[PDB]
């Protein structure tokens, strides 16, 4: 057997070529998302300056947007992606082409999945191409603390540089916090807040910064519904979220009051993994419509959960949920660990072990 | 009889002790250790790197380990050996053809020995590819000894590559 050439030649080898500015952007300054999509699926990379240009130009578009977006139906609402790029490709097949489909993402594009930078680069490129029909909200992972605690900062250092990471951090600050969809739905990543009673409370926030450890901006990104949501006993509205170690748990009477006070139909959010990719919570005793909806767009979460993902396609006064399964993706060892670092302690162990026994 | 010429860290009494251990392992008194004689020890039967070690010790390339190769082999695991020669022995485990570099096919095959059925061939090939890409600085599609140490030279595994003679 050959010692130089690759053994399993059937396995596609990631291209060393890095896309130039001329190859990605046309004469009109429009990004070629098809060229970008195909190259990224081969685990190909771009030049640093090109990647930096996609991030910054996208950031300039985002920072011209309001805290609370105004989006009308029809639109496809999406949940957590968590760096699962090859599942994101399937998402756009199921949810429809952005060339004629309006999109709303609820955040958490990075961390956990080992293709986070490809998710950002592609989504930002789509934002540049479709600035008025594709929309991105901020999730609790789009910040400096979690991306450093998990794998996204590491991913940037391995695949690109820390400069790209910094650019993303500044870009994440520009991400809108919420969206008002079809004058009926409030769309956030986490949920509600004791310091947010009206939609204008969201408009008064200063989002261009690191999310604080506590406050309204923290709660929108971090809060969860109660475990017994709809079947409360001791009630209250907001209680300390012991699962997250920060922010709050919100109850069914809490959200219902918010809906009635702001004349809204329901709340669309993500933040929590679902086996079915979605969950319909207790209907309101006024409309008979679900007061809360969780959307999760990461199938087979962490390659272990084996869950279905879903997107919410709201058109013709019909809220249809498109479930979908996971797709094949190139393998990575946990935390981008290389094989030398992985195997050497085993080498040193077994080889030493052999010699100890032949001398015993 | 003419004297034997070696190069090791061992004292006279240490070469003697290793000598009496060599004779004990030489079941047929052929003067050299064979793969079969190595595998005669139950603790080596479930070890996937025995053949790699033997091939490294076998400096003349005859398939068996004589007394000289035996001493010079074990010497790389002495307490009196530096960090470098212990990392170099590790390098040689991956470098099958002994050309001084680690290629894709080599890294795969040695990994395949150690992994077994814990990963798929396609999966293992991918992480072998990406490992070399990120560690290859001069860009010749292969891993030198310097590029190797640049990756693992802070794991302090030379500490746990020491045997008592």
């Amino acid at each position: 057997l050959s010692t130089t050439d690759r053994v399993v030649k059937a396995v596609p080898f990631p291209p060393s070529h890095r896309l130039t500015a001329k190859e990605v952007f046309d004469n009109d300054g429009k990004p070629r998302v098809d060229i970008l999509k195909a190259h990224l699926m081969k685990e190909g990379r771009l030049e640093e300056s090109v990647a930096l240009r996609i991030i910054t130009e996208g950031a300039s578009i985002l920072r011209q947007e309001k805290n609370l977006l105004d989006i009308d139906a029809p639109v496809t609402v999406c949940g957590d992606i968590h760096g699962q790029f090859f599942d994101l490709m399937k998402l756009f097949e199921v949810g429809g082409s952005p060339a004629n489909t309006r999109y709303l993402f609820l955040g958490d594009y990075v961390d956990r999945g080992y293709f986070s930078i490809e998710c950002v680069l592609y989504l930002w490129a789509l934002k540049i191409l479709y600035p008025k029909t594709l929309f991105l909200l901020r999730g609790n992972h789009e910040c400096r603390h979690l991306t450093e605690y998990f794998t996204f900062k590491q991913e940037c250092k391995i695949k690109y540089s820390e400069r790209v990471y910094d650019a993303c951090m500044d870009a994440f600050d520009c991400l809108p916090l919420a969206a008002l969809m079809n004058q009926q739905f409030l769309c956030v990543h986490g949920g509600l807040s004791p310091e947010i009673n009206t939609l204008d409370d969201i408009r008064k926030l200063d989002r261009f910064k690191e999310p604080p450890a506590y406050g309204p901006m923290c709660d929108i990104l971090w809060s969860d519904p109660l475990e017994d949501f709809g079947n409360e006993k001791t009630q209250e509205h907001f209680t300390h979220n012991t699962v997250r170690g920060c922010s709050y748990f919100y109850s069914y009477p809490a959200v219902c009051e918010f809906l009635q006070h702001n004349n809204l139909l329901s709340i669309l959010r993500a933040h929590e993994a679902q086996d079915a990719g979605y969950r319909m919570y207790r209907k309101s005793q006024t409309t008979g419509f679900p007061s809360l909806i969780t959307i999760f767009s990461a199938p087979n979460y962490l390659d272990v959960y084996n869950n279905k993902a879903a997107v919410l396609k709201y058109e013709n006064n019909v809220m249809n949920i498109r479930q979908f399964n996971c797709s094949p993706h190139p393998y990575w060892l946990p935390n981008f660990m290389d094989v030398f670092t992985w195997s050497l302690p085993f080498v040193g162990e077994k080889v030493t072990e052999m010699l100890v026994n032949v001398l015993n | 009889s003419y004297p034997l010429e070696m190069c090791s860290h061992f004292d006279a009494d240490e070469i003697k002790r290793l000598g009496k251990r060599f004779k004990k392992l030489d079941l047929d008194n052929s003067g050299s250790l064979s793969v079969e004689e190595f595998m005669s020890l139950p603790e080596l039967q479930q070890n996937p790197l025995v053949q790699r070690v033997i091939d490294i010790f076998d400096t003349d390339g005859n398939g068996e380990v004589d007394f000289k190769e035996f001493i010079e082999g074990v010497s790389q695991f002495s307490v009196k050996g530096d960090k470098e020669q212990k990392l170099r022995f590790a390098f040689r485990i991956y470098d099958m053809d002994k050309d001084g570099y680690i290629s894709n096919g080599e890294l795969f095959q040695v990994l395949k020995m150690m992994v077994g059925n814990n990963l798929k061939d396609t999966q293992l090939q991918q992480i072998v590819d990406k490992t070399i890409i990120n560690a290859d600085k001069d860009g010749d599609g292969r891993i030198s000894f310097e590029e190797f140490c640049a990756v693992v030279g802070g794991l302090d595994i030379h500490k746990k590559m020491v045997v008592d003679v």
Binding site: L333 | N47, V115, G116, N118
Partner: peptide, 7 residues
């Protein structure tokens, strides 16, 4: 614990 395990 004979072969190298994925962490």
């Amino acid at each position: 614990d004979q072969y190298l395990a994925v962490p």
